[PDB]
Structure formats: C-alpha cells, structure tokens
Write a protein that binds this ligand. Structure first.
Ligand SMILES: Nc1ncnc2c1ncn2[C@@H]1O[C@H](COP(=O)(O)O)[C@@H](O)[C@H]1O
Ligand SMILES: Nc1ncnc2c1ncn2[C@@H]1O[C@H](COP(=O)(O)O)[C@@H](O)[C@H]1O
Ligand SMILES: Nc1ncnc2c1ncn2[C@@H]1O[C@H](COP(=O)(O)O)[C@@H](O)[C@H]1O
Ligand SMILES: [Mn+2]
Ligand SMILES: [Mn+2]
Ligand SMILES: [Mn+2]
Ligand SMILES: [Mn+2]
Lengths: 477, 477, 477, 238
C-alpha cells in the first residue's frame, strides 16, 4: 500500500540482514519458503522477480506448467524475531514466467484480484478486515492412525483435567490452580498460568508492526488466548493473519510450548474462532453507517449482510474449510450457526458491534469463521458474498435481538442454520459459486481444485477411519 | 412354529434344568434378561405370562406406561451351554398387561406382525431368511474419550500388524505365521490360528439346534470368521441370529478371547457384513423361480428386488443402523453400495446366487446389511420393502453382470449408490417410511423413536468429538 | 478517594510501564482481566471508558445484554510486582454502554452504592473496614471426582502429619521441626519454616501501598499465616483485600508454593477466617465511642451490632458464602457461631476490641466472616445490616463476658447460634433480604442470581457426590 | 430373612474373590441401591387390602395405611433410610422415590400399587423409598406403625397421580410434597413426631432417643466436620 522497495532495502541495510526469506502461500493456507543471501536481494528482485519450480504436488503448477516467477510485496517485509541469522521475511505473488500473468491458484493473487474488483464495481475502493483468531497453548501433542487402533492426546501442565496428577510431567509437585471456576473465565495469576508467554507474544507482534490501540486486547482463559490488533485492507489483513499465526506459534515454540489454531482441540471446552469485522470505504469515507437504519446500518451494509447470510452455505467452504471446523460449529457454546444478524446474540452468524454514532466505527462482524484455512481465500470469499448482496440488493431476513436460546420452538424453526458438515458446504460451493467467479476473482478451476482437495485429502480420509467412540458404542453389538 | 409348550417342559425335565432365563430384545438389538427358578416355570407362564417393569430407559415403557407382560415363544427354547447352573433360555414377546396387546415397540412383535401381514396380502404365507454374519476374534480391546484425548485399540496375538513384535504379550516368543499373504485368504494351519476355537463355536451351534447341510461352511481368514447355517422363517431367523451372536461371543469369551460383530473394527482390513438371502413361499411351494426370467427370477422376485433397490436409502436405517456401518459401506473392498442386482458383481446391493434349475433354491441375496443392529427390525424392513415392490410392481433398473469396477466413467455414473452416512439414511427414513407402516407392521411411533435414538445416542455423540486424524491433519493449521 | 487520573499517568510514565491490566470483579469474588498496551492508556480511558463483551457465562451480561463499558478507579492503580513486562494494574466499574448506568451486578458498583447510601441516610459519611484474612501455605494440592472414587490431598514439607517421613518429597532427609507443640503456636525458627516467605509477602504488600503501623503484624503458625494492615473506606478496603490475596498467592507461587484462603483446608487444624473491624465516621469524627456505654460503645454502635446479630442468618450468605465455610463455623476451635457481642469471648460473632478511652480507636469486630467469597458484597452486606439496625434502633441481646464454653447448660441454651449449612443461610437470605435492597444498594435481581449460583454451582454439586467418610461409615451396612 | 439374605450375598461374593456393598449410593453417576417393601395386612387367613370398587383395587384399610405412610414419611425415613449415604440416592434424578404420593404408574412415587389384577390375595402396596443401609427389624416395624396409625385415624392420602410426574406443569408440580433430603432432617422430624411409634409400647421413647443420639454423634456430626473432596475443586482457589 505505502511501503517502497527502497524502504525495504533500507530496513535490510539498517538491520544488517544476512538472509531474505522468500514466502508464498499454498492452497490450504500454510506459508511456504526458501532462503536467499541478502547480497542477492536487489532491485532486480522487484523488477524481474525470482524463479522457482512447482514443488511438492497439489494445487500449484505441475509438470505441464512447472516453473513459476515470484514478485515481492514490499508491505509484507518484516524482520524475523526467531531466526538466529538476521533474516528479512517478504511475501510474494506467483506469476507465469512468460506472460508475467498472475497465477490464478495463488491465494495472494485472489485477494489482490478481489480488491481490484471492488474498485471496478464503483461500490467502494477499500474493504477493511479486522480478524480475531483465538488459539490454544499446549505442552504436548501426539497422535497416530493404525490398522488396529488410533489415538490423539493434547496436554498442558495446567490443564483442568490434570487436577488429580500426583506429580507433574517433569516429576515436580502439583501446585494446583488448574481448575476452571464458575463466575469468570479470565482470572488473574496464578490461575492464569500463561501471563509471561502471552506478553512475549504481544511484544513480538508489536515489534513486528502490529498496531494495538483502542479496543485491542491481550486476553487469556486457561490455555486459550487471543491478541487482537488493528484492521487492514483485505490483502494485507490476510498477510497480517499469517504473520500473527507465525509469531504466536514460534514464540510458544521458543518457550517450550506448542500452539494450535485448530477449531476444536478440546472436547468439552471452548472452540477457537476467527471473528471477522468488515466494512467498505470510498474516498476516505465510511459507507456502512446510517442513523436511520437498524443498528446504524446503511443500505450498502444491510445488502452486504444479505449476501453473507444468503451465501453462507457455500461461503463456509472457504471460511470454515476443515472437518474439525464442524466440531466448533455445532449446537452448544452459542456457536455462530444461526443465519441471522443481531446486536445482542453471539450465536448469530453476523453481529453488529455496538459502536454508537461514530460512522467510522460502524462495521459488521462475521462470527462463523475459524483460522483452520486460508485467510486470503476466506476474506476474498466474504467480500464477494457481500458484493453480490449489494449488486442484487439482497435483503437479509429480519434481525433478532431476543435471546435465540430461549425462543418458542415454533418461532425458532424459522431461524436457518449453517451446514453441519464439511462435505455439505463443499457440495453447496460446487452447486453455487457464481458470486465467487464475478470479475474473475475466483476461477472455476480454483474452485474445482479446492473441492477435490477437500474431498480427497480431508473428507474421505477421516470418513473411512473408524472413530474411537464407535468402539464404545458398537464393539458389543 | 412347531415346538409345543410340552416339548419345552420335557426338555427342562430331561436336562435337569435349575433356572430359566427370560429373554427379550431391546430397541437397538441387544437381548435383555432376568432369571427365575425352574420350579416357577409351568403352564401359567405360557397362559398368563410373566410380569416385569419398564426397566432401564429408552425405547420401551416409561413411567406413564411402566409395567409389561412377557409371553414365551416355545420355538426359541435352548439349553445354555455356558452357564454353570443348568439353564434354559427362552425368548418372549412383550404385551400390555391389561389388553394383552402386543407392545408396538418390541422388535419381536414387529417381526411377528411382518409375518402375519405377509399372509394377509395373499402374496405368500412364508418369508425365508438366511443370514451370514461375519465377525472378528480379538485378544483385547480398550478405548476411551476424554477432554484432551481419545483412543481405541483392538489386538490379536496373530494380527498381521504384529510381525515385528520382539515377544508376545505374555512374554513368550513370536513364532510368526501372522502375515496376510497374497493369493489366498483362507490358508490352513499354522497360518490359520483359530481352527480349534471356530470348531468349538461350530460344535456349540450344532448342539444348540443349528442346521448345517449343503453349502453351510465354517470359514476363517486371519481373525475374521463366519459359520453359516440353514435359513428359517423371518421371526425365527432373527431369533437364530441373536442366538448365533450369543454362542459366538461366549464361546470366544470362555476361551480367553473377545469377539466383535461391528462392521469395521480394522482400518485396512475386510469389514464384517450380514448377507441376507430371502425368498417367498406359498402352500409349500417356491415363488421366486421362473426359467424364462433373467437369472431364473419370477415376476414376484423381480418386483421384490425393485422394492429393495427403490427403498434402500431408507431401508439401510434398519439394515446398516450404526455410524460404523458406513466405514464398511464405502468405496473399496467391492462394498455392496451399488443399487443394482446381478449374478456376478459382489459390489451389487442384490446378488442372485447361481443355483441352477432347482426352483426351491432360487433366492435373492441382499448383501448390504451388517450385524450392528436389530435382526428383527432389519429382516422385517427388508420384507416390507420387497412387498411394497410386489404390490406396486416396481421394476428394478436393468441388471449388470459386467464388472462394475472397470466401467466407462460416463456409463458408471448411471449406477446409483447407497447413502454414505447414518445421518443420511435416518433422514431418508424420516422422509419416506410408508412402506414400513403398511398393515401396521411398523408404527410411526416406533420409527420416530428409532430416528431420535440414533440422532441423540449415536450420530450427535460421534459428531461432536474430534477424530484423531483431525490432529494429524489440522494441529499445524 | 484522593488519587487523580494524572497521578496514575505519572506513575505509568515514571515506572516505564509497558502494559495496563484491566481488572474487574466477577460475582463469586475472583478478579478478571485483559491487557492493553500502555500506549493505549490515556485520558479517553477515564472519560469514555473501555468496551468489552459479557464473556464467560454466569452473573454478568448474557447475549440479550452482551456489551459492557469499563470505567477506571484511579485509587486502585498499582504496579504489578510479579509480571515480567512492567505492568500497571487498575480496577474498573462495569457500566451500561448506552446509559453509562452502573451495572447492578458488578460487585464494585454495589460497594460504591453502599457508600453513597450511607451518606444519603445522614447517619455518617464514611464506613471504615479493617479485615484480617488468614491463609495456608502448601507445597502441593491435588484432587478429583470420578464415578467410582474421589480424593483430595494438600501437603507441605513441614506439615505436622509428616513427622514419620523417611525422606522428603525431593529425596532429601527429614530434618524434623514439623511437630506442633503444646504451649505456644507462634514458635521462632526453625519450628517456623516460612519466615523468609512471609517477609517477602510483607515486603511486596508494603511496596504495593499497604500501610502497616500500630497493631499491624506479620504472624505465622505452622503453614498458616496472616499479615494485617491499615483499614480503609468500604469500597477501597474491599479492593485492598483482593490486592492482598493477589500478592499473597503470587508471592507464594513465585517461590515454589501454593496458597489457599479456603476456610477449612485441614481437618484437625485451625480454619482461616476474616475478622472484619468496622466503624462509622462523620465530618472527620468517630461515631462509635461513648464513655457511658458498655465497652465504650455509643447508641449508634450498639444498634449497628443489633443489626449484625439480627441479620446474621442471612448476612452469612455473603459473609461465609461457601460450603467449606461451614467446616470452620462448627462447634470447636471457639468458632464465632454465638450470636452475641463481647469483649472477652472469641467465640462471639461480634467482639469489641479493648482499645481504652481513645474514641478514634473504638470499633466493632465481626469475627464470623471468611475470605471464601466476594469482599465487595460481604462488606456492603455488613454495612446494610448495621444501618438497618441503626434506623430501626435494634437492641442486641445482653453482651456476655463470662466464658461461653463453661456455661450452665440451661443458661447456654439462651445463646443463639449461626446457621450451620450454606443451604440454610441461602434459604434465610431468600426469605429476608429487604435490609439489603434499601436505597437500591442490592437488587432483588442480584440477590436471586446469588441464590441460584450457590444452589446450582455449589450446594447441589457437593450434595449429590458421596463423601469418602460415607464409605468408612456405610460400605458394610 | 433380609439379614440372612445380606449374609448369604456378602459371603458368597467373599468366597469367590469379590466384595459386596448394600450401601445406597456407592457410585456417583450410576443407579443407587434400594429396598422396595411390599406390605399387606391379613386376618383369619384372608386378605384385607383388596376392593374392586376402590382406586387400584384398594380397600379402605389399604388406603388409610398409605395415608399413614405418606403422612409419617418425614419421620419414618429415620428408620427406613437411616444413613447419610441414603440421601445420595434419595435426590432428584433416577426417578428417586421422593414424591409423597401413591400411584400405579410412577416409580418416583413413595408408594406404588403393583398391577396385580382381580386376585385379592395379590393386592399389596409397595413402599419404594427404603434402602438396606439400616435395621430391617426397626424399618419394617416403623412402616407397620405408620400404616396402623393411618388406619386408626382414618388418614386420607392426597389424590393418587398416574400422570408422569417428571413432565408436569411447574405450578401443578409444586403441589407434590417431597421427602426430606438430609438425614439430620428426618432425625429432627422423628424427634418432633414419634407418637405413632410408641403406640402399644412397640417403640419406647428411650429407644427413639438412643437412635437419634447414635445418628447425630456417630454419623451426622462425623461426616459434617470433615471437608468433602469436591470442596477443594470448588474452593481451594477462593
Ligand atoms: N472499517 C473498519 N473500521 C473500524 N474497525 C474495523 C473496520 N473493518 C474491520 N475492523 C476490526 O474490528 C476488530 C475487533 O473486534 P472486537 O473483538 O469487538 O474488539 C478489530 O480487529 C478491528 O480493527
Ligand atoms: N427360500 C430359500 N431357499 C433356500 N435357501 C434360502 C431361502 N431363503 C433364504 N436362504 C439362505 O441362503 C444362505 C446362504 O448363502 P451362501 O454364502 O451363498 O452359502 C443360507 O444361510 C440359506 O440357508
Ligand atoms: N474506624 C476505625 N478506626 C480504627 N481502626 C479500624 C476502624 N475500622 C476498622 N479498623 C481495622 O481493625 C483491624 C485490626 O485488628 P487486630 O487483629 O485486633 O490487630 C485493622 O485491620 C484496623 O486497621
Ligand atoms: Mn468478537
Ligand atoms: Mn454371501
Ligand atoms: Mn482479630
Ligand atoms: Mn420393585
């Protein structure tokens, strides 16, 4: 957006950087990389780019499309706080060597195309995304899948399921303060056993350019935590999310822990979601506010919500893209499965934060997403769903501020739910994805690849493997 | 059918029976019981019945319908070969104390109603069922489900996954012969390590009245086994299945093993199914044969097949009633998921055994079922599906004898598949179950109870619990 | 009371604070928190407040009342001595975002309302509270509750029950000095094994603004300890109590120990109580003294005592709010269960400290309370009970200075006792709580919530679980 | 016979490597163990509980007996459910016989009338609330005395309830009296009202006072002064 290639070279020189880490995003959502010496990092990298091979195998350029060209995004340049050798990390866009044409299956290109499409519609020129990803801090994790058995086990010294431990893992005495009490789930130390670690995470985020102001907090509940930061334009917000996960995971790693952003690592404890605040702006001014509308929402904002709610069944294929996503999105902890908007209900897919009369603070919050996938694709899909709602003036059903939990059974049957299985949302995406292909942001090719990837690599593998509970339930049949 | 109450009293006297075990079937399919002294077993038991309480809680008579009356079925009387104290086992029908009206939720009453309905339609007077249930013999099984972890583990000394064991569980040396070789899966000893156990099972079955003649074999492959026996009329065939499972499970138990009839206990090994051969007879003569028809099938037989194939999506709710059922019914080991009939294909839902010109041997084989449920309900549901096909002269799509595996992709898309999830078949049963309620054989009440039971006690519990493979797949997201 | 927002900003600047910990109290009594960077801590925090979500679930704003606004109390600002990253802790009041109306279920608001009500009655303008909370220092604690068993175990290297230990937990030799001798329970080292730890606690309290003067001591008996400090006005005294517990618990935690403020952690050893000294003042002058009255008590003071004794049965619902509270409040260690006032008896609910002729030192001491609950609610409830006694001129029964222990059985039957069970005091609170709702200090809403919380989360859970002693007593029945 | 039964059950298990318990609630999260007591009065070799015209085939004598059981239940339980553990079974849940009403359907009813038909010799009432944690001689005797007091004073039991007590309109369910939920309670009630027991000198005030003291000093107090494990889960962190 505003950082110049020269700013990056200055950063590299001042920091005495010795290596540059070339990063790009894979299909499912994990950042990939290779390293080059800082001496090889010059103007030609920004002008001509870097050559590399379609490596590994699914999503990207196979051996009929092999070679790729990588072009850097100066706004993503950050000094790595973990690598011993001073390193500068930069994210790249994948292009076709010959035509210099942005590769259609590169998640970062999709996000860029989404931003350009927004501008082309004239509706707005900027889509701001604020995402809040919760995560769990564990001490260990082990699992396997064999012919005659299977298991998984996550553990934490201070886990509430360990109150009866005679001694700790390391032989030291059990000092308590593990129990999860009724009344409040954000107790101070010593009940809060991750204060210093979270502070290290926060310190690393701040040193890595994250902006923490107004309602940006660092919070923890048991082993779960969340550190929210200032929003950003679509693409860069997605880059920020990847950076956040990287910083959270490695700060924990360097401090003897292991973090997971999976939706539901614990059965009988809160899942981890990614609440996404969105809003459209044009010429430096907000487009979501209107004193006369419900919850201070403009016609643009309401139509956007109409798109999100209407497209949710397919949108979730990018927004909650894993089998584990549906262990969180299930009746219980006031799961955002109710296809309605509200200001009160937290079990509503879309919630409008109470921000008052300030037009610049008005935004909508899509609560259903989680961080088990690709933020570039998720944010883009959310924008496309919202834009389709604006273009077709889709009206969302009447908002609900009455507590959805205690509602007369016949009146509660009028509240649509989100699909409860990944195979479902994948089927829905396959059946209805035209809003995604608008302006060429998503291609049928990418969408078909995503559908195949999920079915073959996730849905089928889990489905063919007997679940442990099936033995409790059926060994005796 | 032919045994008299006097025959039972003679059996009891001759065998010097000291206890009588009163058995009745619960909703899901497990036999329940209580014991009375032989001295209390007289004519009044057959005339007046025995009183008992709706005990335990789901399916049967709650505390608004509490007390039940049990009437004995003399044909089910058998001497228990396992109980130390000489005991006579007898199955009972649950009646309403006051009206002496057969309880509508007693599986054995449903099977009896199904047989009576058959007679009332005039179509036939007898429905013969031959069922072949495979099972696995293990040495141990353990599992659990906790907040931070879950596991399951089945094991057998001679399991092919144990070739590398330094020593056996009991410290003795590993003598090999565990490997599962290519070429033939029914090798003789010592590769076959369960010869004596299976013989004990067979001996117990024979001593318990099972008839083994013509094509009735005892077969074993690794830890898997099957002992087939002569068919019987619907109700008694279902009683025979319960007896078979009882004898197999306890023969193993008394010999230091543990048996499971669950559909898919091993990932990467054959599942366990229950192939059900069916045929209608009238006035002592077969109704399934016709030289002129395909595979020697009469119009009646073909229409029956039309009913099975047409109703399969809902029929499977009683025929493959567990979540584990769908780990077997999945693309692979030539799983009976293809909704077509054939003489060659074993992946076909219905197969017509090649029996020649003998009309008495002509029958159809529904291959899709497993023994993870209730045989009384499964057999009854199969009959009702077949009878609805006969009454509405439902024509099954053209049979397929070409190997279904290697079929041109466009021509293979014309082959309907069975649903791949329990939630699916339950949804289908809820939407279409009129063929079941014909003649009052099944009641909407029973069907709704079954649907609720499966959703609340099986589908939901498995669905909310993270699967071990999800950790392999998503811990790193 | 006297600290300015500017004083807080100066403290933050001088201490080079990097984080600000936002604290607020939950219903049962545990402080909650979330952290913001110091850079986000400015004048707008004091003027506009901070936004946050009704999080966790019971007591506070659900999803029909969701969002809350937090306003800081400058008098509670303290530098955290435990957090690695320099942090400033501040307590907040919960307000309604829209109306800026103090949330009726926020314990800190109740205490503030109580102080404002005092002023409105004209009776006095300040209520001073001096609280002395005892606690135990342990090395370990473990416990669990399962279907087939349950246990708990607290331990300390120097515990008197460990005299026979062959070697210590860490393998080191048993050096003795664990025995609890007759004659004196405050022996010097080495019998006193917590001298340095208690000094660290005291040092931390002093560095955190606690005032220790005249009769403020640091005392220890075995693993039990107490450090008393100077009183404060109601609200701030309650804030001081929370701070005290925080400092005691974390000083122990940082030094390899674990502290508990529970009423009765040890069976056969002294319980832990919270003696609360109270007194009313007006225009800078004491209102409790009168040379002519018994024990130097004024009419106002005597009526206050009348209120405490009259309302005790319900007052204890906030003053001794746990099931464990009644293991301390039981016939034995001269437990403050006798509903009378005195100067001699320590088993008297109210004791008047012998302070001489100095009017400024005259005060009453409610001995019955413990620190197992919420100090904001406890102190407020005590004030309301006392004020109701003053308004209705309630006369306490005649004081007793004769040793209550050795009293003629017929004359001892005239001494009322406090209820002996939490369910009892909760029932009494439900039946009589009008004195609490006076001036709107407590609302029926809050009181009903408290009653439900205790019944559902504490009373019922303990009541349904078999006690270990029941097995000693009844396994053999 | 009950004492013999317990002896035979306990020792058969003992000789076979097991250990048996008749305690009311040994397992948390599993069914408790009760002692359903069927009772009936006879005279000159003939039944006195039957009557075709009465509800559930009950005679005036039988109904009054039930009136005595339900009326005296609060104190009767001091001999019928005499232990602290007894109240872990007699608690809202597994359809615990805590509802002070009679019925033919409800198993959560203190008294249930078994459906036996028209045979007068089979008509009897079943007191479901008891357990075997005490003394059968005292329990059976106390039950008889409660029933006889009901017959002598023609105590009428409140209207029977055959509607499922579980799903009942909250305002209509508040009219159903419950049994006390604590041993200290039933002991207090026995102390306050035990005249029906002393009738004909069957029980003496002496025996009753001894029982009350025994329970308070040897059972109630000992359990009450000892912290429960769950209190640590609940309050160690206060
Ligand atoms: N247009 C916008 N204006 C202001 N904030 C926004 C906008 N679009 C997205 N946000 C994000 O809303 C998120 C926070 O939510 P909360 O859990 O309510 O504190 C932050 O991460 C914000 O920075
Ligand atoms: N009507 C019938 N006539 C002959 N056999 C039947 C009939 N109805 C069912 N069967 C059963 O067909 C089953 C065996 O199949 P297989 O695995 O091919 O040896 C046996 O269990 C038979 O006894
Ligand atoms: N009005 C008052 N004047 C003096 N001290 C007070 C007043 N109100 C409460 N106190 C508290 O009385 C407490 C101490 O008791 P002790 O265990 O006797 O040393 C201290 O914590 C005091 O500071
Ligand atoms: Mn949020
Ligand atoms: Mn077969
Ligand atoms: Mn004191
Ligand atoms: Mn009974």
């Amino acid at each position: 957006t505003e950082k110049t290639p020269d700013d990056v070279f200055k950063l590299a020189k001042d920091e005495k950087v010795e290596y540059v880490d070339v990063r790009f995003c894979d299909l499912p959502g994990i950042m990939q990389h290779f390293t080059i010496p800082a001496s090889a990092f010059d103007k030609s990298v920004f002008d001509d780019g870097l050559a590399f091979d379609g490596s590994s195998i699914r999503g990207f350029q196979s051996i009929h499309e092999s070679d790729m060209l990588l072009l850097p995004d100066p706004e993503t340049a950050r000094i790595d706080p973990f690598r011993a050798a001073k390193t500068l990390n930069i994210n790249f866009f994948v292009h076709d060597p010959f035509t210099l044409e942005p590769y259609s299956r590169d998640p970062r290109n999709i996000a860029r195309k989404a931003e350009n499409y927004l501008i082309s519609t004239g509706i707005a020129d900027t889509a701001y995304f604020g995402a809040e990803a919760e995560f769990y801090i564990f001490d260990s994790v082990s699992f396997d899948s064999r012919a005659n058995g299977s298991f998984y086990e996550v553990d934490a010294i201070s886990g509430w399921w360990n109150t009866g431990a005679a001694t700790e893992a390391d032989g030291s005495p059990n000092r308590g303060y593990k129990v999860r009490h009724k009344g409040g789930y954000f107790p101070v130390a010593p009940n809060d056993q991750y204060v210093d670690l979270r502070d290290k995470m926060l310190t690393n985020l701040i040193n890595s350019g994250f902006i923490l102001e107004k309602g940006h907090h660092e919070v923890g509940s048991g082993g779960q935590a969340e550190i929210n930061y200032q929003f950003n334009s679509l693409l860069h917000a997605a880059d920020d999310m990847q950076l956040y996960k990287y910083i959270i995971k490695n700060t924990a790693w360097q401090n003897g822990k292991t973090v997971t952003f999976m939706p539901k690592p614990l059965f009988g404890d809160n899942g981890s979601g990614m609440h996404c605040h969105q809003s459209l702006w044009k010429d430096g001014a907000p487009l979501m506010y209107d004193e006369t509308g419900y919850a201070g929402l403009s016609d643009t904002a309401r139509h956007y919500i109409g798109g999100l709610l209407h497209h949710a069944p397919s949108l979730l294929a990018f927004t909650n893209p894993t089998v584990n996503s549906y262990k969180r999105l299930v009746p219980g902890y006031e799961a955002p499965i109710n296809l309605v908007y509200s200001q009160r209900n937290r079990s509503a897919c879309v919630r409008i934060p109470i921000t008052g009369s300030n037009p610049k603070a008005k935004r909508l919050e899509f609560r259903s997403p989680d961080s088990s996938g690709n933020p570039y694709l998720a944010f883009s899909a959310m924008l496309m769903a919202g834009l389709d709602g604006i273009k077709n003036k889709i009206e969302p059903q009447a908002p609900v501020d009455k507590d959805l939990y205690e509602l007369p059974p016949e009146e509660a049957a009028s509240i649509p739910q989100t699909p409860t299985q990944l195979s479902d949302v994948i089927d829905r995406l396959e059946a209805d994805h035209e809003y995604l292909t608008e302006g060429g942001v998503f291609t049928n090719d990418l969408i078909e690849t995503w559908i195949s990837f999920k079915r073959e690599n996730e849905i089928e593998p889990v489905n063919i493997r007997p679940h442990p509970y099936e033995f409790a339930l059926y060994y005796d049949v």
